[PDB]
């Protein structure tokens, strides 16, 4: 349980059951004069609420100024002020990537609305699937604000610069929600998806090579097939307008046009230009090579020392090469949950190695 003071007599209690940096489920209670009441419960991640820890006056000032930006019409800011404040509040109480994507889509919408011509596939890049029924309210608030500022028949653009600035600053509210990868495994999986999808769609993703510069007949066959498919686009067929590839005719045209000093650039250059981690794991705090080197060095030092008996001071060695009870605690406190788990794993390895050496 944690405590926070709110008034002269009543305090607030925060009850939970787990430790670490994972997402937990919390329960909030109050206490006025000893009678412990019930306020509620929720489920959230603690490392996504660092912004409002003390920014209770900065947000008020910035929203007050953003609302006073629209002081050109007495009656328009009175309707957008509370709406803006409620939208900001709902954004702070619900951090998610979908909200950021929605506000970026709103920014692009405003950018396309200000100008005169826009792409025909615009409205399909603004929709985002909402879940947990929490994005509905923020999307409705943003849409209502955009409509209240943009709608109108004739007297809807009395001061369009102020309106554009306000809407842009509203769409840019996505920077308030932090970007700290809500889940690592899902993000890595999605990255692998986005990486390997176009290559499977094209049809040229080969399987594990020899890693030495020796390809089989099928590998080189499919490589040459992909190379041919890359340079097999014509200048008249309108069917291939979204698949990768280039036509050789236009390339030859551009080359012959650039060679004979026709473009704004030419080949008249000066100053002649001719003057241990593992790759299969990026993001891990410790690779297998480093763990193995550490355990080998530690067991070697312990074998050299036995020239038996060994106290827990060997654990101190683990703390010395990775980053006397006081120094031990000071070097042990600086580890994270995954770090302390890896340290316990290394400790287990070193201890079982010493035990098997003892036999």
């Amino acid at each position: 349980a944690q405590r926070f003071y709110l008034a002269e007599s009543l305090v607030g209690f925060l009850f939970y059951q787990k430790t670490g940096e994972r997402s937990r489920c919390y329960s909030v209670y109050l206490s006025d004069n000893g009678v412990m009441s019930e306020q509620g419960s929720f489920y959230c991640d603690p490392k996504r609420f660092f912004l409002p820890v003390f920014s209770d006056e900065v947000l008020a000032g910035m929203c007050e100024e953003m609302t006073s930006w629209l002081d050109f019409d007495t009656g328009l800011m009175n309707d957008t002020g509370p709406i803006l404040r409620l939208l900001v509040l709902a954004i702070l109480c619900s951090p998610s990537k979908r909200n950021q994507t929605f506000l970026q889509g709103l920014r692009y919408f405003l950018m396309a609305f200000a100008n005169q011509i826009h792409h025909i596939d615009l409205t399909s890049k603004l929709v985002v699937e909402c879940k947990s029924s929490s994005e509905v309210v923020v999307q409705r608030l943003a849409v209502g604000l955009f409509i209240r500022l943009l709608s109108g028949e004739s007297d809807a653009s009395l001061f369009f610069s102020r309106r554009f600035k306000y809407l842009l600053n509203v769409s840019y509210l996505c920077h308030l929600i932090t970007k700290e990868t809500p889940d690592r495994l899902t993000d890595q999986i999605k990255c692998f998806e986005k990486f390997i999808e176009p290559k499977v769609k094209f049809g040229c993703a080969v399987v594990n090579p020899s890693l030495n510069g020796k390809l089989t007949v099928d590998q080189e066959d499919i490589m040459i097939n992909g190379l041919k498919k890359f340079f097999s686009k014509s200048l008249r067929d309108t069917e291939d307008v979204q698949t990768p590839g280039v036509c050789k005719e236009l390339l030859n045209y551009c080359v012959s046009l650039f060679n004979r000093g026709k473009l704004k650039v030419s080949g008249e250059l000066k100053n002649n230009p001719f003057r241990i981690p593992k790759l299969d794991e990026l993001g891990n705090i410790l690779s297998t090579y480093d763990k193995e080197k550490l355990v080998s060095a530690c067991v070697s030092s312990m074998a050299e020392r036995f020239k038996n008996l060994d106290p827990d001071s060997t654990d101190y060695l683990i703390l010395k090469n990775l980053t006397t009870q006081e120094e031990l605690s000071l070097m042990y406190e600086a580890l994270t949950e995954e770090q302390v788990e890896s340290f316990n794993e290394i400790k287990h390895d070193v201890q079982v190695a010493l035990a098997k050496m003892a036999d």
Partner: protein
């Protein structure tokens, strides 16, 4: 040890480790010179003969990862050392070729400013502005396209006209075309252990049907994001030049294009309203799609607003982007020491107030960071974070100036600080006008703060009265015998600051919440050093609450001398720091900070630009090989050790290259002893703003501090 471990795990509450130890205990786990000469020390894998797909030393292996962004995560490719060197050579060649070019703006701020002003003029005049963002620039390009391009080019020499042979470049590109990208082991385990997914379907189809579990993926079109950036930039530049030529020849318009290797901006001037240009732009889109330059649906064409590198220009002015800077200021609280956090927040608030945000919001951010550093258990210090109750004078003012402003605001009726400013002005006049002072102030300052201040005073002029009066104001400096020892949440596997800044100049995934939590936790152990280590509250509990009408003007900030008799090791005068700051501002940005502050006698929407009004007297150019000579002269042992092992140009720094600068001699010794001035690392840097948008309501409420001539107009 096995039985000891089992017993120690059994006596505790957890039984899982007990079961693991119980299981591992139960034993439940049961004469040619080309072949016999490459096993001792022969570097057999050295590149001597290569093929069109490898180099006899690997196949340019890579590694896949992601990078965090606001909207969606970006790709990331990290390579081995050999492929890193090859990519470095390729990118150096391509960046040289691009620097030889003009229109591209990726590593040239001059062309960026040119594009900015051209876009502004076009928006003010009403030309056709088209911002083209392209979708899937990375995962679509292929090294074969660059290969064909470089095969088709000539690259004529400037004075030889020799048609340089791009043989090695084509060889390295052929090597890159057959690169091997290794998949992460986490995705492999997640798909092996075990909703519809196409890549998961491909993984399960290539799991054991054709071969083994996929771990290495080679293909034609990869072009790893952040690998071939310069080559892609140059290719896009030439393609856009060809396209603008074609448009100029077909639709008799005047196009000018600026590129950034990911997005472009085209300014089109039409002859002789804008409803008859749809065919032109769709033909341009078709021609770009004929190349590998597919345009994204987010690209916009109009005549009212333009965008380039997230910099929106509209008719008349520019959008300030308030909330972006506000969120950037509230975020990225990376604290190793309170001083570096204060400096980071200083830079951020400066670049924020540069874009006409406000003067009442920055005060709130400064109060916020003050409360953050106070909550950590450090207590408020005279310098601390950014001062409160600032003004629009962030222009023509550096960190030293605002620190001086804070120290001046500490005192209500400045008589001690005014006297110190007068003494600093006297020293400045006698060192510049009288011009007889050098390297003796170096001998007088190296001692410390107390004797140096009274020495400067008796050089100017004083008595024992001033010695016992000025030197009474003391503040607690916890980092007096060194720096605060602490181990924060860093990554695994692992002297004044001016030396470190110079070493950084010569040479070439963690969360903010957890970082601040570790900061507050490590600021509670034995941190302050002496002689041994102890607590901060232990030091702050030894002060005596005398309350003698002089240590009460600002509690927990300023004390008297006898109030620190119990703990006197951490007690330094603040007037010495004020003197140092005044002299440092004098050597930095002129002598207009010696006068007294006078106070003066608009719809919140009248914005306008202002320029700094600084005047330097410190040899304005101030390049390298000047601080190095001064350090070699003044601090020989400090110039030999900890400095210049990684240097081969000592001859020019030794042969008196404009030796004995006007003020770099004395304006450098105050920086090495004081741990919070930081001016030598600031003089070797640009303003980075050069212009400040501000509202008129803040310009009329500023303080008028312009100094008359100290000689009272009496000199000549």
């Amino acid at each position: 040890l096995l039985k000891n471990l089992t017993t120690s795990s059994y006596v505790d509450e957890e039984y899982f480790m007990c079961f693991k130890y119980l299981l591992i205990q139960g034993h439940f786990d049961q004469f040619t010179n080309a072949a016999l000469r490459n096993l001792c020390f022969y570097s057999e894998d050295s590149p001597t003969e290569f093929t069109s797909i490898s180099s006899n030393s690997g196949n340019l292996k890579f590694g896949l990862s992601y990078k965090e962004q606001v909207g969606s995560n970006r790709e990331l490719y990290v390579g081995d050392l050999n492929t890193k060197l090859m990519t470095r050579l390729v990118e150096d060649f391509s960046e040289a070729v691009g620097n030889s070019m003009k229109y591209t703006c990726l590593n040239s701020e001059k062309e960026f400013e040119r594009a900015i002003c051209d876009m502004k003029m076009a928006v003010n005049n009403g030309d056709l502005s088209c911002s083209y963002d392209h979708s899937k620039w990375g995962p679509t390009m292929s090294p074969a396209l660059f290969l064909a391009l470089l095969q088709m080019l000539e690259l004529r020499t400037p004075v030889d006209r020799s048609k340089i042979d791009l043989d090695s470049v084509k060889s390295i590109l052929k090597w890159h075309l057959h690169k091997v990208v290794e998949v992460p082991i986490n995705v492999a385990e997640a798909y092996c252990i075990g909703s519809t997914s196409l890549s998961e379907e491909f993984f399960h189809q290539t799991m054991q049907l054709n071969g083994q579990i996929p771990s290495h993926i080679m293909s034609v079109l990869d072009m790893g994001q952040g690998i071939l950036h310069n080559t892609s930039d140059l290719y896009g530049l030439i393609t856009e030049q060809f396209l603008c030529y074609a448009l100029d020849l077909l639709y008799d318009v005047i196009p000018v294009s600026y590129t950034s290797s990911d997005d472009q901006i085209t300014l089109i001037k039409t002859p002789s309203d804008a409803a008859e240009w749809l065919e032109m732009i769709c033909f341009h889109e078709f021609l770009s799609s004929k190349l590998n330059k597919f345009v994204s649906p987010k690209s916009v064409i109009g005549t009212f607003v333009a965008e380039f590198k997230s910099r929106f220009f509209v008719m008349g002015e520019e959008t300030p982007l308030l909330t972006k800077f506000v969120a950037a200021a509230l975020h990225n609280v990376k604290c190793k020491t309170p001083t570096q956090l204060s400096e980071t927040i200083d830079t951020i608030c400066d670049q924020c107030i540069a874009n006409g945000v406000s003067t009442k919001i920055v005060t709130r951010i400064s109060k916020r960071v003050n409360q953050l550093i106070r909550y950590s258990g450090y207590g408020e210090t005279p310098f601390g974070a950014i001062e409160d109750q600032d003004v629009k004078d962030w222009v023509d003012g550096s960190r030293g100036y605002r620190l001086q402003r804070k120290i001046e605001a500490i005192f209500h009726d400045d008589k001690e600080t005014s006297f110190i400013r007068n003494c600093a002005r006297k020293v400045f006049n006698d060192i510049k006008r009288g011009r007889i002072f050098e390297e003796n102030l170096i001998n007088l300052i190296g001692r410390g703060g107390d004797e140096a201040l009274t020495g400067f005073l008796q050089y100017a002029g004083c008595s024992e009265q001033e010695v016992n009066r000025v030197l009474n104001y003391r503040w607690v400096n916890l980092s007096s015998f060194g720096d605060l020892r602490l181990v924060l949440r860093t990554k695994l596997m692992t002297v004044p600051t001016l030396i470190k800044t110079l070493q950084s100049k010569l040479s070439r995934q963690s969360s903010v919440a957890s970082g601040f939590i570790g900061f507050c936790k490590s600021m509670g152990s034995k941190c302050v050093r002496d002689g041994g280590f102890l607590y901060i509250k232990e030091v702050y509990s030894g002060v005596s609450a005398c309350t003698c009408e002089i240590c009460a003007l600002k509690p927990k900030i300023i004390y008297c001398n006898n109030s620190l008799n119990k703990v006197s090791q951490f007690s330094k005068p603040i007037l010495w720091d004020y003197f140092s700051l005044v002299l440092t501002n004098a050597c930095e940005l002129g002598e207009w900070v010696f006068s007294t502050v006078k106070e003066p006698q608009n719809n919140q929407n009248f914005f306008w630009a202002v320029k700094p009004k600084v005047v330097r007297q410190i040899e304005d150019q101030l390049g390298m090989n000047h601080v190095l000579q001064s350090i070699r002269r003044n601090y020989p042992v400090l110039f030999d050790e900890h400095l210049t092992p990684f240097m081969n140009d000592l001859q020019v720094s030794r042969t008196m290259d404009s030796g004995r600068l006007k003020f770099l001699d004395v304006c450098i010794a105050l920086d090495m002893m004081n741990e919070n001035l930081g001016i030598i690392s600031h003089l070797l840097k640009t303003r980075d703003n050069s212009v400040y948008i501000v509202k008129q309501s803040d310009c009329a409420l500023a303080h008028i501090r312009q100094s008359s001539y100290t000689d009272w107009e009496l000199g000549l």
